[PDB]
Design a binder for these strands. Structure first.
Lengths: 136, 114, 117, 178, 54
RNA sequence: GCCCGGAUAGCUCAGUCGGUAGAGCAGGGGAUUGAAAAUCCCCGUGUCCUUGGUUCGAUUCCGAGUCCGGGCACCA
RNA sequence: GUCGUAGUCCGGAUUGGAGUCUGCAACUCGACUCCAUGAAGUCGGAAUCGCUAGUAAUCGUGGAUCAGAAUGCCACGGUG
RNA sequence: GGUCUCCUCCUAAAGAGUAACGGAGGAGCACGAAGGUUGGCUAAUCCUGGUCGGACAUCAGGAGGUUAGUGCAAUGGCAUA
């Protein structure tokens, strides 16, 4: 929903490397933004994605984007490599190809959400199953 | 020395030790000192004839000690002699105000009779 | 009892089946009215047994009155003598719950001429 | 003895008709009571209030339990180990005793008496009594009271439900208000 | 560890026989008293008052 | 950036094996003075720097943070 | 004659209950009566005031103001 | 600067084991009992009631199911406890 790359509340560890695979989802609201093409949101992106999902029309409509981070990173200044890794301060959500955005409101959204896609990290179609018989 | 007779409240604040009298309370013993000038922070001793005795003046306005109780015991009986529920309960040591005499009423009824 | 639970030491020894295995038990029962007993091979052969009050024995309803060390004792006697074979084989009587009075009279009723410990 | 008989003899059959079952077994029975005082001295529970059970003891006629404590560290300066209780329960014949010694003697002991709390049934049948002090059940020289931290007591019964009850208690109980 | 306050060593001993048996103890905790059984060179157990007798 | 220490009353500071914390000053109310001081009497409204944890319970104990202070950042 | 050194048979503040008299009228804000309540106070640091004889000390009595709110003020005498 | 022994978990590719100045913590004890055995007993927490409560104190029933407790880390284990 939001990102604020709100930390997962606090710490409890902060390590692990990476590894991606396959997406796992459908829809919840009405309009959607399918992922496709592996990658990882800078989290800071989700903020940029949302901050842009409302310019002309008021905050009207229920925007619900649904992807949750949890993934500290960490980097190193201009130093050698004691292989520890300083703080994280980045947070790159793992995103393989799920797809998550919701614009609970009747309208044209395509040209609306795509207005924010360029902010995203990679390419991502739309597709919107207003409803449900796809999956029991 | 005892103001309203008997009991000499000594070595304590005025009002606080004034209530010693079997008739006045935290408020009453207080309301009297005002029109008496006598402060509360002053121990009865600290006072003088024109201080401690003066208190014994504006005290004859209210009823106190012995007869106060008697005048009440009788007044009580006045309404209690009548076959009213209150009396019928007053002469049995049962709550006449509005408590559950069916249980929990030690101080009311009296000791336990198992 | 068993109502409130079963998660009690009452089952601790009943698992005599392990190690002791061959070790046979008596079980013995309370049930205010009777006492029961029965003796079977551990678990590998429940296809064994003894006798409870077994009404028919001398009369028809096992003509006995009482339940103290009097009736309780005979309550075992039958399983005992009737199971003469098993005695030296070392059985065991499993308290079930408590080892006092009724079950005692039942257990010891066997110790006399039977169940060599 | 005293009162236990009022039960079968002039108490069972009222219930057998009112509410109306068919088994003199389903007739609402009275399990027990269990008294117990409470508030203990966080620090002072020792000489102070050990004579607190001395009362509940003879008041019932048994041996108090004084109980213990199941609370850890958090805000109250006690660490799950002190006595601070009494308990004392009666289900035996001596249960009817303390009964025939309640309704009759001092259910009505305080000037603020008027009956028993209507709305105090445990939700399924039993009722928790309370009251705050005095002895109400004299059997002491009475020149020694140290306002011994009151009395709770909660008569336990096989009452099926809240209102199913009431009519049970409401059948000897000469004290209960109106 | 070897703080003269906490756990120390208990030489222990028996009554006539010249055995040993060792173990640990304390100091502040009630002491200046001890005795168990333990089995000697041979035979029966008994005695073994060790050091610090009742 | 690195290591070591400080953070307690308005100021400057002292203090605690873990449960209710102080001093000098300033401040305040009396006093004495013609009036100010100086002096005399009586007075602490401290969330013990922040945030996590141990605990029944944390100013105290454990980890981290900000801030200050001392030292250091060298060959190149 | 009593009570016998306790917070009392001391001292009366306070409060409650209900009452009187003034005056249109007494909640705010009155004097007093009865009943009950009966506190502080067990003579007071630092420091400070008056008093040289009918004085200080203590005990009452009256009056001005005034419808009715005096322990204040003015005044009188007893004991000393 | 930090670390040099030992104990727990991840890395560690579902038998062992395997590294890095890799990610997190603990030990350098305690205990005449905190061991042995025998007999016996089961959490935490919430709901309704209960005097001395107004968040939690002992009592009563109910929901009461490793979410309790394990002498000290973590893992594993524990009701036959």
């Amino acid at each position: 929903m939001l990102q604020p790359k709100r930390t997962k509340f606090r710490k409890m560890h902060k390590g692990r490397n990476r590894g991606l695979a396959q997406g796992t989802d459908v829809s919840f609201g009405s309009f959607g933004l399918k992922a496709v093409g592996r990658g990882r949101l800078t989290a800071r992106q989700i903020e940029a994605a949302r901050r842009a999902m409302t310019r002309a029309v008021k905050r009207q409509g229920k925007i619900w984007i649904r992807v949750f981070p949890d993934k500290p990173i960490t980097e190193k200044p201009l130093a050698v490599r004691m292989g520890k890794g300083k703080g994280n301060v980045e947070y790159w959500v793992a995103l393989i190809q799920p797809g998550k955005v919701l614009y609970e409101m009747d309208g044209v959204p395509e040209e609306l959400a795509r207005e924010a896609f360029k902010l995203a990290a990679a390419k991502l179609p739309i597709k919107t199953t207003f409803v449900t018989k796809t999956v029991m | 020395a005892r103001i309203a007779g008997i009991n000499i409240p000594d070595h304590k604040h005025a009002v606080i030790a004034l209530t010693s009298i079997y008739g006045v309370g935290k408020t009453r013993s207080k309301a009297i000192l005002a029109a008496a000038g006598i402060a509360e922070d002053v121990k009865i001793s600290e006072l003088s004839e024109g201080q401690i005795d003066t208190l014994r003046d504006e005290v004859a306005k209210f009823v106190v000690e012995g007869d106060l109780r008697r005048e009440i015991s009788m007044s009580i009986k006045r309404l209690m002699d009548l076959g009213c529920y209150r009396g019928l309960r007053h002469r049995r040591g049962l709550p006449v105000r509005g408590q559950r005499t069916k249980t929990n009423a030690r101080t009311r009824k009296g000791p336990r009779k198992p | 009892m068993d109502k409130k639970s079963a998660r009690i030491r009452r089952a601790t020894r009943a698992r005599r089946k392990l190690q002791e295995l061959g070790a046979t038990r008596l079980v013995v029962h309370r049930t205010p009215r009777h006492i029961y007993a029965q003796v079977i091979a551990p678990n590998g052969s429940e296809v064994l047994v003894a006798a409870s009050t077994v009404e028919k024995a001398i009369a028809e309803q096992l003509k006995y009155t009482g339940n103290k060390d009097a009736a309780a004792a005979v309550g075992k006697a039958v399983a005992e003598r009737a199971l003469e074979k098993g005695i030296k084989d070392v059985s065991f009587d499993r308290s079930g719950f408590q080892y006092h009075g009724r079950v005692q009279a039942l257990a010891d009723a066997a110790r006399e001429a039977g169940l060599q410990f | 003895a005293k009162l236990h008989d009022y039960y079968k003899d002039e108490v069972v059959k009222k219930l057998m008709t009112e509410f109306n079952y068919n088994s003199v077994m389903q007739v609402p029975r009275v399990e027990k009571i269990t008294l117990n005082m409470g508030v203990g001295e966080a620090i002072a529970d020792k000489k102070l209030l050990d004579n607190a059970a001395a009362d509940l003891a003879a008041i019932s006629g048994q041996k108090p339990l004084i109980t213990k404590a199941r609370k850890s560290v958090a805000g109250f300066k006690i660490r799950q180990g002190y006595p601070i209780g009494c308990k004392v329960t009666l289900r035996g014949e001596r249960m009817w005793e303390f009964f025939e010694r309640l309704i009759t003697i001092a259910v009505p002991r305080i000037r603020d008496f008027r009956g028993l709390s209507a709305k105090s049934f445990d939700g399924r049948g039993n009722y928790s009594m309370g009251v705050r002090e005095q002895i109400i059940f004299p059997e002491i020289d009475y020149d020694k009271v140290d306002r011994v931290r009151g009395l709770d007591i909660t008569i336990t019964t096989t009452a099926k439900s809240d209102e199913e009850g009431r009519a049970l208690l409401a059948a000897f109980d000469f004290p209960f208000r109106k | 560890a070897k703080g003269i306050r906490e756990k120390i060593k208990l030489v222990s001993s028996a009554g006539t026989g010249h055995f040993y048996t060792t173990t640990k103890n304390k100091r502040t905790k009630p002491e200046k008293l001890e005795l168990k059984k333990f089995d000697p060179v041979v035979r029966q157990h008994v005695i073994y008052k060790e050091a610090k007798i009742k």
